[PDB]
Each structure stands twice: as structure tokens, then as C-alpha cells.
Symmetry: D2
Subunit: 352 residues, 4 copies
């Protein structure tokens, strides 16, 4: 049918398509709430993943099941489901290795608006419904639930990769929606001091809400010097990268103490090389582990985060600053992500 799609490199618009058909194990979902992402901007305007032709955008959606294949057992038409941004193929060798995000190739667990039609349409296709859908409790509002498919699972993954010990000091570089969930994720991993690096006031306020004990604004000086002064030269036990340019990797290495971990969940769109400073990395021997992973998807990941919201461990509704209602307003919410206003964190479009 109609869908907000990438017409060509650098240009987008509504196009004409056929309604997707479900396989024996798949399901067709109609969206109830959707959200745009900064990653979709990188695909369109920077060409970071190559050239696409008439591909629907969007990968964050909470919808209602309308049709299932003959083999779907746990979902029926009428069920209220959370759809993860990553819907991998669960029958490959990379799944047996424990990295479903790369099932079938690097980043191949991320299908929506990458190698597969996204969620910005009246219907979309979800492969392996029993493995890639989670029921949505009535107690969770749509605006909060639509932060789970991507923002919550990415930010929490950064905290998971960070290997946070109880009471450790954690720095979160960047407090966009992913970084704000990284701040909340560190609090969920038992972090004591959480130092957040950001400038936008609407984000700084939300960072304190999610557990940040210190805010480092670049208006006071270089980030490295500020954090080293805050930690009295000790540094941080772990740094979570959730924003910035390639140089932020150098900053993370400089502020993490020997034996610590740099956990990256930032999608670097430009630059050939990510710099690792030789001297500050101990010339290769400082035991500063560097991790960088795509957000996990699938049913279990969604079910675990739904319980965190259900039992009031984290409230993602603070991420939602703008709410829209039309299918035509999907374009408007997208435009907000193109040129970030200072009062926007994450916009949500309620469809039905």
C-alpha cells in the first residue's frame, strides 16, 4: 500500500506497494504506535549502509496482531504485542554462538528498514512471530511501550556490555534517548556514581531522573579533564558510548581506569577509522576492554524489558516529549529527527 520510504539516496517520500504476506511462521502486525530513529537519518542522508530503492523506513513499533501463519502457536489475531527492532533469523550458526544480532551476517538481526520493509505502513511483516513478538500488558501505555523495541534495549545493552560491578563509577558519553536508557541501565546494574556527558537541557533533566549523579557540560572544558577531576584522577570503572563522533572513542579510553571497560552502542556513520590512543590504552596493555554491539532483539529480550516496565523498575515515558496522531504525522515526527530541536528527546506517533 502506502508507506513512508526512501526514494533514493538523500530523498524520501510516500510510495505505492503491495500488502505483505505472512509465511507459515510469520505474522502481519498493524502498528498502534511508532517512533523514528536517528539511524534512519544516517541511512538516508549519509548512505552509511549503501544504496536502497523504495524501502519503507522505521523499526520501532508497538502493534496488534491481525494475521498469523498456520504454525504460529503463541499469537493470534487481536493480541497486543511489542515488536523488537531486531527480528533475527533464529536458525543459523551465529544463533548457536550466542549472537542473534548477527544471525546470517554482520548486523543481520536488524531487518526493518535495512534489508526489509520497515514499520511505517498500515501493516508490516514480522518473521518468526513466536520468537520475535512479546505480549503487551494493558498496564503499559503505548508511548512507554514503544521505547522498548530499540531505545531501551540498546541503552540497557550498553550497560550490560560495560560489566558494571556493584557500586562502580560509570560515565555515559552522550545523553540522547539511547544514552538516557544507558544511564537507567547502569542504575539497574547497581552503579553508584553515574556521570552523564551532555548539553541539551531537556536531556540533562531526564538524565538526573534516570539516575545521573553528575552532569558534565562541554561548556566547562574538555570532557577528559572534567571527569578526571570529578574522580580525583581515578577515572571511571566503565564508560558507555551512546553518541558523538569518532573522537569520542579516544575520550572513552582516556577516562576509563586500567582494567575497565568501554561499551559502545553508538552507530558511527562517518570516518574510516575509530581512533584508539596508544599511550592512554597502555600501549596495548592497559586491560581496557572495548566492546561494541548491536541491540539484542527477539521475544525474550522484549519480555524481560516489559517486566522491568511492568514492575516499575524503569519508566521510559520521560523519553517521550512529543506525541502525534496521523499517518501524515509520521512524516512530521521524522522531520523532527532530521533537524533536532533543543526540546525534543523522542517523538511518538499514535496510529489507532
Amino acid at each position: 500500500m502506502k508507506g513512508f520510504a526512501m526514494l533514493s539516496i538523500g530523498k524520501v517520500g510516500w510510495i505505492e506497494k503491495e500488502k505483505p504476506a505472512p509465511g507459515p511462521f510469520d505474522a502481519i502486525v498493524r502498528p498502534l504506535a511508532v517512533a523514528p530513529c536517528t539511524s534512519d537519518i544516517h541511512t538516508v542522508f549519509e548512505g552509511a549502509i549503501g544504496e536502497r530503492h523504495n524501502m519503507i523506513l522505521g523499526h520501532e513499533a508497538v502493534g496488534e496482531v491481525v494475521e498469523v501463519g498456520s504454525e504460529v502457536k503463541d499469537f493470534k489475531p487481536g493480541d497486543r504485542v511489542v515488536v523488537p527492532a531486531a527480528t533475527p533469523d533464529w536458525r543459523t550458526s551465529e544463533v548457536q554462538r550466542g549472537y542473534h544480532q548477527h544471525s546470517g551476517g554482520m548486523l543481520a538481526g536488524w531487518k526493518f528498514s535495512n534489508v526489509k520493509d520497515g514499520v511505517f505502513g498500515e501493516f508490516f511483516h514480522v518473521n518468526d512471530a513466536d520468537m520475535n513478538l512479546a505480549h503487551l500488558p494493558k498496564e503499559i501505555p503505548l508511548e512507554a511501550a514503544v521505547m522498548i523495541p530499540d531505545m531501551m534495549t540498546t541503552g540497557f545493552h550498553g550497560a550490560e556490555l560495560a560489566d558494571i560491578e556493584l557500586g562502580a563509577t560509570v560515565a555515559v558519553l552522550g545523553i540522547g534517548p539511547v544514552g538516557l536508557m544507558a544511564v537507567a541501565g547502569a542504575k539497574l546494574r547497581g552503579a553508584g556514581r553515574i556521570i552523564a556527558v551532555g548539553s541539551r537541557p531537556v536531556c540533562v533533566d531526564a538524565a538526573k531522573y534516570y539516575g545521573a549523579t553528575d552532569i558534565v557540560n562541554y561548556k566547562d572544558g574538555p570532557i577528559e579533564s572534567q571527569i578526571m577531576n570529578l574522580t580525583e584522577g581515578k577515572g571511571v570503572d566503565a564508560a558507555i558510548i551512546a553518541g558523538g563522533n569518532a573522537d569520542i572513542m579516544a575520550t572513552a579510553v582516556k577516562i576509563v581506569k586500567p582494567g575497565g571497560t568501554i561499551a559502545n552502542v553508538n552507530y558511527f556513520g562517518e570516518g574510516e577509522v575509530l581512533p584508539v590512543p596508544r599511550l592512554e590504552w597502555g600501549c596495548g596493555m592497559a586491560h581496557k576492554t572495548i566492546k561494541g554491539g548491536l541491540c539484542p532483539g527477539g521475544r525474550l529480550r522484549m519480555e524481560r524489558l516489559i517486566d522491568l516496565v511492568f514492575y516499575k523498575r524503569v519508566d521510559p515515558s520521560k523519553l517521550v516529549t512529543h506525541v502525534f496522531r496521523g499517518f501524515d504525522n509520521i512524516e512530521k515526527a521524522f522531520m523532527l529527527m532530521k533537524d533536532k530541536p533543543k526540546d525534543l528527546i523522542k517523538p511518538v506517533v499514535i496510529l489507532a
Copy 2:
């Protein structure tokens, strides 16, 4: 000096001993606040660690440094410090393996009221001050800080041993002071649903405060049946044992799902064998990992738990139900632990 001591098996009383002298790396501390433990009850009236003669009891104390050895660098007379219940020798082979709790032998990190005069005296000896003391911030009151040396580090260790994934369902068997900190620890590891098992109303109330979402009373029926009904037959991702008799190990194995973890921090004082049910343990193949560890000690452990309290990640003051004043009430608080009233969780003696 004076000290409340274990005279023989079944008898305690105040005695007179010589004030301990510090070695070049040691410190002499006078207590500012102390707390009795159920373990000392087991030592005196059950002979759980054998017979002692004129051994000062107690291993939970916040104190003021009065004297240090010539080689102590980070602590001077007058410093208010949190003293860990475990003060191990940091120069053994077990420390290089990462198990300071067993530095020099099984449970050898536990010295106070075991192989060394405890803290229930006008002064006590702390070996290796720079490695086994942590500075106490003025912002933390004495009643809350004296929960850190033993209760918090033990309860949090149960949560650490449990290998909790984000959103996992955790059962805490026993909600005494250690179990209440296991509940708080489970919340500090991103647990979603936390099922606490206990009956005493003062403990049930504190368990809800520290994050318990469900309360299971053993007076209403078998714990296994209740928890399986709550989890709709799925079981729990992890069970933390913090109380009960030897049979509670069988209960933990039965409620943990295949691949889960049983983390024990309960001190079993009676029974020759802890039963592991064959069928419910998968006849040996259910991947139900069983862990059991003594609480971590040392400076770094105390500093990180102090940071957790300082940055308001947990408030252990709700563990304290009775506060008395002065040395003479150490006896009153000790006997309070033997005859457990239904309103007692943890008593504190302020030595101002």
C-alpha cells in the same frame, strides 16, 4: 580494657583483657556503633566454630581510628571508618585466585569473633588497615553504616552470585536482614519480579520497601507449590538462599528453572548434608548452578557499598529496628538476637 566475650559454649559476659597493640600495618579502632549477628549466637550457644575462651564477640562495627602502625598510609588517629566483617590477609595464594574470603584457609577472611577478638570491646585490632578499612562520610549516619560491614555485603553477594540478567525473576528464600539486602541487591542487578519468602510482618514490610513484588508465606503451604503457581509453572531465573534449614536447598533447586542459579549466603549451622534433589536437579544435568559464598570484605568492597548508600541507591537504615546506647547495652542487644521477637530485624548499639 573491657570486652563482651564468649566465656565458654553457652556462656557470655564482660571480661578484662589487654588493649591490643597494632603491628606496623595494623590499626587500633574504638567502636562508635556496633551490631550483633546471628552467627555469634551460633558460635556461643551451638558451638558452630568450636569452643572459645574469653574471645570478644562481634564483627559489625563502625569506629574511630585511635592508633596506626608505622606503615599505615591512608588512615590516621581520629578517622571515622567502616570496618568490614571480613578483614583477610591480603598476601596469600587465595587472594591471587580472587577469593580473599578464603585467604589462608576456608572462611579465613572472617577473623573477628572467630580466630580474633571481635569488636564488642573498648578497642579492637584491624589487620592491614590500608586494605581493610574505608573512610566513613559524614553524610551517612551510624545506624545505617553499621549495616554495611556484614548485612549489605552478604545480601548483595547473594545477588552477585545469582548471575541475574536484566528483567529476570528472582526468589529470595528468607527475609532476615541478609535476605532483605538480597532483595535490594536483586533490584540493584536489574531484576524485574522479586519474590520474597518470609512470614514476620516487620520483615515482609521491609522486603516490599527494598523491591519485593510478591510475598510468599510458608504458613500458607509449601513454598515450591506457591512459587510455581506465581510463575505459571515457569519457575524463577535465580533463587537466593538467605535463611532456613538444610531443606531450603531442595526448595531452591525445585523453584529454579533449568539453566538458572541457586546462590546461597545462608550460614547452615546444623545438619550433616545439604540435600540436592536428584530428579529436580535434572538427575545431575539441569544446568542448575549452586553457589555458596562468604561475604566479601576489604576496603574496596566497603568503599563501593558506601558509594551505593552515599548516592542513595539503597538505604539500609530500614534494617535497624532497635537502637540502644552505651557498652552495657551490647549484652542487651546480643541476647535480643538469641530470643528473636517478631518485631526485631537488626539491633544497633550507639557508643557515644
Copy 3:
């Protein structure tokens, strides 16, 4: 078709069933070489997993694909394959948790001769062929290859569970075919000293071949005292249980040092409880981790063990002491596992 089956508890015999039909993702395999297992003895004559009716026995087989479903992509009729004893359903919640051995329930990844007709028949059914089959290189003979499905993956799993550090001292309690692979697995994890506990000379000879540095005969005296004398009172860093009765769990705990690991891969067929000694387990606080897991299965596991054999890291051929030829000798080889002669390690029936 014909099949050697368990009629009821205590009864075995040849039966007749319908040749299995493959689903779209399944494959029908005819066996080229099979081996009986001690686990089937426990299932039939001890009723360790309950009563079965006309369940064809056997779960260790190398076969030839004769039929595949329409969706099988990597295997065709005529391919010679190694079939893992564990062939789990790869589309479950337990797979997303990382425990395919319990996909769909405790031990539910083990289907052959458990909840599904085994391999001791003219044909057998393999669910999810592309995920549960591995190609057999021509360089590996059938007698050696049939040690991979069960013996090698189980024994190596014991070493994996043991958390062996480079140079650590490992004890292997029991040197049947599984224990001998635990010896080889421990060598493959960088173990230094490997202490093997067994009495049968044919097993003692194979233990030395696979890397055992010391032999402890339990008929020669108490295991604990002998091992404690060998390690000069230190104990072992890890103990792998691969045989014995329920009492061997107490033996393992007594010989492992504080902080070490007890890794069980032994299938306990009798007894209600596996005893854990309270005092030797530190009264619950010795950090002696107890693990017990079913062997991993699936394509990737088989492929990696095949690579270990291909690149000559392990030669499982020395496990095979008896080779017979023909379907009728499946009964003879099965009975050989029942009345264990002193010269038997593992028998193989060639159906070529």
C-alpha cells in the same frame, strides 16, 4: 521397520514400528554406526526418567541421510552425517536463554531414547536437520566419529563447566568413556595436573593416553585422603564428576579447594537426594560452585568437535574396545553395557 526398544521398566526387545516421515525441516537418517550408552541402562532397568512404552533405544549414531523435508537446505539424501545425541527444538524461549539442552523443558533437548524413538532402528527421525546435523569428513572413521555425538561432547562439557584456568589441577572422578573425554577436555582447557580416579586397567590405560598424570584407585583406599596427599593438602582447583553413586558428590566437594568448581556430567540414576556435605562446603560459604549440565548438541557443537578430531587435537578411537557388525549385534552391544566386563570402554556396531 525394526527397532531395539524399551518395552517397559526392566524389559527390552526388538519391536516393529512405522518408518518415520520427515517434516518440512526434518530428515530421515539410516544409521551407519551406533553405540549403546550407560544412560539407556539407567533408563530401562533403574527407571531414572520414568516408565516408557516401546521407545526404541540409542542416541549415539553416525548415519546416512535418506530423506529430507522440502525446507532442508544443507543436507541431501546420501550425505554422511554425525547426529548429536541432543537434537533440540531451536525455536523456544530456553534457546534464547542460552540453554538449548533444556529447550522446551528440563532435558528436553535430549530426544532420542527419552521422548522420541532412538537410533537403534532401520531409520530414525532428526528434527531441524540444518540445525541438528553435521557433515562427516571422510578423514574420520565411523568408529571414531560415533564417539562425538555423546561421549566427546559430554566429557568436554564437564571440562567447560569446570572453569579451568591455565595450569590448574583438575580431578576427574570416574574414567568411563565420559570421564576419559573429561580428561581429554581438561587437557584441552590447559590443565596441568590431571588426577584420574578409576580402577579398571583398560580405563586407566586410556586415561594416561588422554592426559592423566596421576591415577587414584578407589578400591585402593579413600579417594579424599589419596587426592589430598597428592596435592599436599591443597586440593584440586576443579573436580569433574563422570561416574559413581550419590556419595561421589560429597567426595568432589571435599577435594576441591575453596573457590573451586565441581562440574557434574554424571547421570545419577538412583537415590532421592545428592548429598552436599555441610562442613566441607564451608557451611554454605566456601565458594565451591556446583554445576551439573546435560551435554550440548546441535550442528555447531558437532562441527567444532569434528574440527578437534580433524586437526588432531583429540583421537576418540581409543574409547572403542569392541566393534561388531550387524543389526542383531545391537542387542549384544547393549547387553555388554548392562553387564560391564572389565575390558569394556565403549562398543560400536557397524551397519555398513
Copy 4:
């Protein structure tokens, strides 16, 4: 007391100092066998660790204890010992975090020929003898034992950091003495295929001896293309960096599959930045972990590696290509490392 020392940047020569005196916990050792290292060449002629003045060189030594402090308990005059290159202070906060290599600061566990007179003297000082010395069994020759302090512990550390699963494919970039021990280390962790990258025939021969299944010579083409062709486009499960310049980091990321690990133990002496390719690192999301650590030291590490040699798990004598006799030949063996002949791997000077 004489010692071969670094006079200034670019100059070396023999000096005279006063024989060092041990503190109460230290020991004075006279060397029985020493070996020069490439790190000392970089220190003297490239100033890789800054400018030093009149510092005795050398950090690889087997020696005889001649004097101990009053508090040394496990070592007496006359004991033959293996001295780790890293002799950290075991009483710091970084030790309680589990990183003794950085006890007191980044790389602060490395004292010999860094902040302390090295082992190229008639005597040298060992701090904390009971924690930093290991008894040398008479069964291990000096030439083999002197490979343990540095080469073996470094190379094996690369294999440990690599997170090798049983049967995994491992690439070792660089086959100098450290890389050759990384190959042996990969074999110890259960690697199947081991791909070694090198050109010198004496190293290629030793690489096959230690377990390499494939050799990649740059004379046949680019390393990235050769390795991807060998693995049929799959890549390797882990890459161990043990040589080369900063550009080798980019090669490692390119050949490791998503979810794998890059383990670096190479000492990068020049360059401001270590390049990480953005696209081949999944734009930050490929789950390609990068680790880089200094070699472990201390008594326990040495004792476990001694056991590996004692029980014949690894023979490091293949690393020794040149053997000299007498103190005066320390200069000759040192200069041998500066202008490496194609037949040199590691030289050893036998003393006494």
C-alpha cells in the same frame, strides 16, 4: 656489584652499584639464567617508556635466593626460583579489582627495567618474595624456565583474553617468541584450527611445533585476503595480536567474525593512534571485542605455568635459539636482540 644498564637514550654499558638490601618482605636473588627482550631494545633506542638514567636492564630471570627479609616465610637462601617479569605490590586497590598488572598505576606491576634496576646484574631485588617468587623444580632446565617469566605468561595471556571456545578457529598475528607462546596458548584452550601469520623460517618451524595448522606468509598476498580465503569467508573466532605496527589492529578486526574477540598482547612502541576500521567493526556494533593486557605476574601465575612445563603440556625450549655463558655475554645477547638475525627467536645467557 656489576650490572648491564641503560646509561641514556641510545647508550648502554656496564656500571657498578651497591648490592641492594631487602626489606622485611623482600628477597635478593642472584641470576642463574637471564634473557633479553625486545621491550628493552625499544626502551633504550626508541625511548618507548621515556628517558631513563643508569637503569640496569632485563626482566626475565631464573635465579637463586641469597638473602630474605625477616618476614619472608616461603623462601630461604639457596632456593632456585622463577622470577616473574611483573612483580607488583600486592597491597593496592587495583589488586582488589583483580588487575595486579596495574597495581599502583597503569602497567605499574612491571618494575624490572622500568622503575627498578633489572635482572642484568650480579644481584637484583625482588619485592614481596612470598607473593612474587615461585620455586623452580630441578626437572626444568634453565633455558626453558627463563621463558616462563615473560614470553610464556604474555603469549598465554593473549590466548586467555581471546575467549577461545573448544574447537574454535584462532589466528595469531605475529610469531615472535610471544606469538609462538600465543599459538601454544591457543592449543591449550582447545583451539582447533590455528592460523599463524609470519615469514621467518625459524619462526614458522616453531609455530608448527606449537600447534599451528596453517601459516600465512605476506609474500603470497595481503593477510586479510589470505585468511578470509582459508576460512571460506567465515573469518576466525578469535585473533591474537602478538606483533606488528599499529596497522595490524585493522587487520585483526577485518578477519574476526562478528561476536569474536581481538586479544592484543603486542607492545606498540610508536604511533599516536591504533586504528579500528569503522565498517569492519560493524560501525561500532559488530560485537568484536578488543582486549589488550600486560602479562600476568606473581607467584601463582608462575607456579601454574611451571606446572604446564612440568607435566609436559608445553615445551618452551624451542624458543631458545642462542645460548651464551657468563655475565659478559649479556651485552652480546642484548645486541643480538637489536639487530635480529633471521635464525634468532630468543637468546639465553647461562650464569653461575
